[PDB]
Design an enzyme around this catalytic site. Structure first.
Site, short mmCIF file in Angstrom:
data_model
loop_
_atom_site.label_atom_id
_atom_site.label_comp_id
_atom_site.label_asym_id
_atom_site.label_seq_id
_atom_site.Cartn_x
_atom_site.Cartn_y
_atom_site.Cartn_z
N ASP A 1 0.81 -1.22 0.00
CA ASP A 1 0.00 0.00 0.00
C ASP A 1 0.85 1.27 0.00
OD1 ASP A 1 -1.63 -2.17 0.96
OD2 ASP A 1 -2.26 -1.04 2.77
N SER B 1 -0.48 0.62 7.49
CA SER B 1 -0.70 1.77 6.63
C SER B 1 -1.18 3.01 7.39
CB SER B 1 -1.69 1.40 5.55
OG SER B 1 -1.00 0.51 4.63
N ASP C 1 -5.41 1.95 9.14
CA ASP C 1 -5.23 2.71 7.89
C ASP C 1 -5.78 4.15 7.97
OD1 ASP C 1 -4.35 0.17 7.04
OD2 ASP C 1 -6.18 -0.20 5.86
N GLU D 1 -10.46 -1.46 3.69
CA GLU D 1 -9.10 -0.99 3.96
C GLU D 1 -8.90 0.39 3.38
OE1 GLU D 1 -6.43 -4.33 2.70
OE2 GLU D 1 -6.60 -4.82 4.76
#
Length: 489
Positions: free
Chosen positions: A18, A75, A146, A200
């Site tokens: 990512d 992330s 995230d 996500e």
């Protein structure tokens, strides 16, 4: 190193996934990313870092935020805290702040949680320090991750907003803070639209419609794995309004968890291909300009992609905007172009009728940008043959019987490394003025298709042989015309 992209970012060695922490500061664009600094498989998550002045020529830097015995660094996002609301720098030297998910190990004091944490830099991203008070926000969840942070000003107040996921719940959770440290829950969105995988890598931002600054919408980005239109991981979006507390979607097709697959083509997809995941935007870009970049791979098979000492590339960056056609507001996305006219050689094929069959283009093309405009007319099909060699080709075909544009990579090259890899990706693309405009980027292991000036995009990895550089136009049946083809490499 036959698959090394010429104009997509990769790390010199090792695994990436990512994009993270995307932020502009003082002329420099910062790309961070999920990275294993110690091998080519997923593990030891740390934020890798690269910098550029133009979003296209990157200098790979040291890791910004390293994993340790207690935490892997999952992330998240970054902001320029220009007025030092966090207290992590000073008024004269304000901090660049990363808000990231700590994934705590068994050795940590809060084992097994995913919680939000801060790191900061006082030297414009050269060096980083973890905040001593991490984690700053914990829901006692293994899947709360995230965070994407932005500054909001409105009737509710002026504060930082975090959009994050409860990934397993398939929900976005929104929080506010004055200082990036103490957070208060605002609202929870979803599940809605695509829900056939964990949610996500969310994002939330405001965009003008068709360049009218009086007519804005908010866009909520939600990535999902699996559950994408084309199979495996993908990005989706919603268009609506954010009131400072909650996002109100104006584009929800199904509310709650999906009941079946029947509405999947109606959900808002960021891309219709297999390899555009975890896309999120850059913070601190002036004048509302919205730039996104994705991880150009798919969790179905990323581990097996046959690239040797490094694993995965990023997509081209995209400028994202809103447009209305026939009354519906939708996303438009166009690549930031890596192949300018001055530096590249160019071949044109001028207007001509297309016979039923294959018209070879006199250009070998494997690192190239192809612009083509086709008028299908009465033909049954028209399109391009890409990356062609003796036993390999990738076929981009517009079918006039159903109005679908398809990229078939089943015979594109190496496909046996995972049974989920060979595929045909489809997206509906209405003609405009009877014509189809395509901009296609070829790089050593990828095809990116931008149709109708960014109304629909399709991103697929391919692994053809080095000799598979043939390019051709084709028509099936009589009646199609080539308006123009331009190839630049």
């Amino acid at each position: 190193d036959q698959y090394r992209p010429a104009f997509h970012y990769t790390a010199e060695r090792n695994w990436l996934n990512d994009p993270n922490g995307l932020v502009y500061l003082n002329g420099t664009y910062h790309l961070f990313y999920q990275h294993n600094p110690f091998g080519a498989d997923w593990g030891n998550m740390s934020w890798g870092h690269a910098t550029s002045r133009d979003l296209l020529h990157w200098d790979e830097q040291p890791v910004a935020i390293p994993c340790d015995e207690h935490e892997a660094i999952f992330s998240g996002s970054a902001v320029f805290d220009q007025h030092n609301t966090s207290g992590l720098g000073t008024a004269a030297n304000p901090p660049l702040v990363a808000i990231y998910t700590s994934a705590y190990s068994d050795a940590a004091p809060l084992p097994g949680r995913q919680a939000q944490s801060l790191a900061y830099s006082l030297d414009e991203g050269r060096t980083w320090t973890k905040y001593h008070g991490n984690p700053v926000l914990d829901r006692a969840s293994a899947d709360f991750r995230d965070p994407k942070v932005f500054w909001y000003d409105g009737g509710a107040g002026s504060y930082w907003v975090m959009v994050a996921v409860e990934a397993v719940q398939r929900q976005v959770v929104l929080y506010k803070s004055a200082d990036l440290k103490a957070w208060e829950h605002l609202s929870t969105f979803g599940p809605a639209n695509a829900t056939g995988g964990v949610w996500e890598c969310p994002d939330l931002f405001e965009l003008p419609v068709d360049g009218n600054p009086e007519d804005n919408r908010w866009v909520l980005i939600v990535n999902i794995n699996p559950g994408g239109i084309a199979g495996g991981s993908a990005g989706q979006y919603f268009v609506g309004e954010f009131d400072g507390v909650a996002f109100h979607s104006g584009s929800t097709v199904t509310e709650g968890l999906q009941k079946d697959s029947s509405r999947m083509r109606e959900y808002g997809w960021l891309d219709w291909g297999r390899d555009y995941y975890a896309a999120v935007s850059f913070s601190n870009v002036p004048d509302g300009r919205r730039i996104m970049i994705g991880w150009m791979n798919n969790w179905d098979y990323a581990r097996e992609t046959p690239t040797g000492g490094w694993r995965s590339a990023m997509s081209l960056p995209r400028e994202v905007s809103l447009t209305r056609v026939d009354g519906k507001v939708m996303l438009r996305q166009q690549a930031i172009d890596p192949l300018p006219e001055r530096e590249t050689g160019h071949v044109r094929l001028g207007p001509q009728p297309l016979a039923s069959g294959v018209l070879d283009v006199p250009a070998a093309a494997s690192v190239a940008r192809i612009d083509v405009e086709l008028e299908p007319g009465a033909a049954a099909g028209v399109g391009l043959v890409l990356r062609a060699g003796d036993d390999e080709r990738t076929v981009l075909r517009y079918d006039t019987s159903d109005g679908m544009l398809r990229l078939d990579r089943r015979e594109s090259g190496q496909v046996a490394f995972h049974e989920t890899f060979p595929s045909i990706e489809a997206m509906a693309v209405p003609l405009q003025g009877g014509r189809l405009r395509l901009r296609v980027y070829l790089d050593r292991c990828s095809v990116e298709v931008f149709a109708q000036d960014g109304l629909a995009t399709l991103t697929d990895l391919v692994f053809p042989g080095e000799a598979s550089t043939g390019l051709a136009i084709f028509a099936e049946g009589e009646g199609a015309h080539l308006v123009v083809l331009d190839v630049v490499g």
